[PDB]
Design a binder for these strands. Structure first.
Ligand SMILES: Cc1cc(Nc2cc(CN3CCN(C)CC3)cc(NC(=O)c3cccc(Nc4ccnc5ccccc45)c3)c2)nc(N)n1
Length: 543
DNA sequence: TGGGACTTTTTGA
DNA sequence: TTCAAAAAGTCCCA
């Protein structure tokens, strides 16, 4: 059930400036009405609009048709259209619409109980409103997904969400100069699946307003990040997008009776984006952040991808059969050549890695099963059946006791920089202990030809700085509230500089490392050091 | 007695 | 062959 305030805002956004005198026959469609939250409000708005200009319509058009008593019949005959797949909800909505007036004379309501994505729509619509469903993967049928791939190939790929196709439908059946307004999951704004959908939206319609609630709990007891999209097919030359980006994600939607008061408040920020200048990922930042990002990009002559080699952690396929507590007795059964240090995301802090509390049995170095039979029978064999259900074990590529994705031994066993893949801040650490990690920690190492130009200490010094934290978070992908995705595709794009401040930055980073490593804690001074380093970085970037 | 955050491994390429 | 992205269900406490 969509919140009433958002429904009212969407309906008013679509219908407020409709010239009922010029076009007293508007077609407003809900594609996922369900109980009919949007359609009842549309009915109320239309009834008020018709009654306000009833005598003007009576004078302009047929005098006998336009009467106050006939408004209900006219709205139900020519104006309101709803579609859904639940017949009980359709009947409830039809009863609610009939009870709005209180057959007597051929009362007909244009409500359809059908698959909206498969219906052959006989005519397009002036206005479209609503909230497409959020049910995918588990709910879809094998035959249904194949039909989606064939029919909606321009927005639907692999395991993409269903509502993508709904966008494809809403644009297609929107009359020229019409208005559409929906509330959907926000994930398509920056996910790789939505690239085709975003291109389709950009090239087919004009986006007017984007309200981005980020991780705010819009829907009660549902963990979906929602956003409101308003678009039109009007012949416009400028096509600038208003963006209302939320600031406080911990708000509840009761601050005012109207969403406009919330948007106009300090809990939201507003900025304009030129649609023609949109990239393929829809960064959607304001002017100050854009200037900051542009200056940093211009100042830096190198990037992480240019000078570093990145990789993903070990994927064992069954962690319980290979990861043990470093104090476990069964580790006496394993030769120390097979044991490697193992860390988690929580082990990663700024500039350093916590001491490994776990050991990984690098079983790929076990050649035959007869020599190390004790390890296989008494440690790894406890999950052997599960290990045999892995894809590569079935295909015959991987032995049952081997790691499914053991990567390269030498990549991990070197000096390198590690970072968690999901964090609330930049946490890049130098690994001095040849630590191994799961896929929750990514790693990279400096290329040989860039070793003299760049050092690990300097890299972690600038990367953990507040400047680079803001710089990354500007374009970073947000998947949860206060949690960003630190993945190689976005991390390795980070640009880095090298100037006369290099030596002092590296020295401050080394001081921070030395303070962090020493057992007796005096960590407060690190903050002070950090501050100084940030200053230098700003002096380098002119910010 | 109800309500949200969390890391392992499955899978396309 | 192996990369890396993203899908995905179990749990507890005041
Ligand atoms: C926040 C919360 C959790 C909770 N239990 C709970 C907690 C935890 C984690 N803890 C442990 C203590 N800390 C060190 C960290 C937090 C784990 C579990 N079980 C688990 O079975 C568990 C443990 C680790 C990872 C995962 N797979 C997923 C992780 C993340 N995304 C996913 C999305 C879809 C599907 C699966 C996951 C499941 C259950 N109970 C209450 N009250 N609150």
């Amino acid at each position: 059930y969509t919140p009433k305030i958002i429904v009212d805002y969407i309906v008013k956004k679509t219908l407020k400036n409709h010239d009922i005198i010029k076009n007293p026959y508007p077609r407003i469609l809900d594609i996922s009405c369900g109980c009919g939250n949007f359609l009842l409000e549309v009915y109320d708005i239309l009834y008020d609009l018709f009654e306000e200009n009833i005598y003007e319509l009576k004078k302009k058009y047929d005098e006998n048709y336009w009467t106050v008593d006939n408004i209900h019949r006219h709205i139900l005959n020519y104006c309101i259209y709803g579609a859904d797949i639940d017949e009980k909800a359709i009947s409830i909505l039809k009863d609610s619409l009939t009870n709005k007036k209180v057959d007597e004379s051929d009362i007909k309501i244009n409500l359809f109980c059908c698959d909206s994505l498969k219906k052959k729509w006989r005519y397009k619509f002036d206005y479209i409103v609503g909230n497409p469903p959020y049910i995918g993967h588990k709910k879809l049928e094998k035959k249904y997904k194949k039909f989606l791939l064939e029919k909606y190939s321009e927005v639907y790929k692999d395991k993409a969400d269903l509502y993508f196709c709904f966008y494809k439908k809403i644009i297609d059946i929107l009359k020229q100069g019409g208005i559409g307004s929906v509330i959907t999951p926000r994930y398509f704004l920056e996910s790789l699946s939505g690239k085709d959908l975003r291109e389709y939206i950009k090239s087919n319609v004009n986006v007017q307003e984007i309200v981005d609630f980020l991780g705010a709990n819009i829907f009660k007891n549902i963990g979906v990040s929602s956003c409101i999209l308003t678009f039109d097919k009007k012949k416009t030359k400028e096509t600038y997008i208003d963006v209302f980006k939320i600031k406080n994600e911990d708000i509840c939607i009761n601050k005012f009776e109207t969403l406009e008061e919330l948007l106009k408040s300090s809990k939201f920020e507003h900025f304009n984006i030129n649609q023609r200048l949109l990239s393929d990922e829809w960064i959607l930042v304001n002017k100050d952040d854009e200037t900051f990002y542009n200056k940093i990009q211009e100042k830096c002559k190198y990037s992480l991808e240019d000078i570093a080699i990145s990789f993903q952690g070990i994927i064992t396929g069954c962690d319980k059969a290979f990861i043990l507590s470093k104090d476990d007795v069964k580790l006496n059964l394993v030769d120390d050549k097979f044991l490697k240090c193992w860390i988690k995301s929580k082990n990663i802090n700024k500039y350093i890695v916590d001491k490994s509390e776990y050991r990984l049995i690098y079983s790929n170095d076990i050649d035959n099963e007869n020599t190390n039979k004790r390890i296989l029978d008494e440690i790894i064999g406890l999950y052997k059946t599960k290990l045999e259900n892995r894809r590569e074990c079935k295909s015959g590529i991987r032995k049952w006791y081997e790691l499914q994705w053991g990567r390269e031994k030498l990549f991990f066993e070197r000096k390198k920089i590690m970072y968690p893949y999901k964090s609330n801040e930049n946490r890049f650490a130098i690994d001095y202990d040849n630590n191994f990690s799961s896929a929750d920690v990514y790693s990279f190492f400096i290329k040989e030809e860039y070793l003299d130009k760049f050092s690990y200490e300097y890299l972690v010094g600038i990367l953990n700085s507040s400047v680079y934290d803001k710089y990354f978070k500007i374009t970073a992908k947000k998947m949860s509230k206060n949690i960003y995705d630190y993945y190689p595709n976005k991390v390795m794009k980070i640009r880095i500089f090298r100037d006369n401040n290099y030596e002092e930055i590296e020295n401050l980073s080394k001081q921070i490392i030395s303070i962090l490593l020493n057992k007796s804690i005096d960590k407060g001074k690190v903050e002070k050091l950090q501050i100084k380093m940030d200053n230098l970085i700003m002096d380098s970037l002119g910010i």
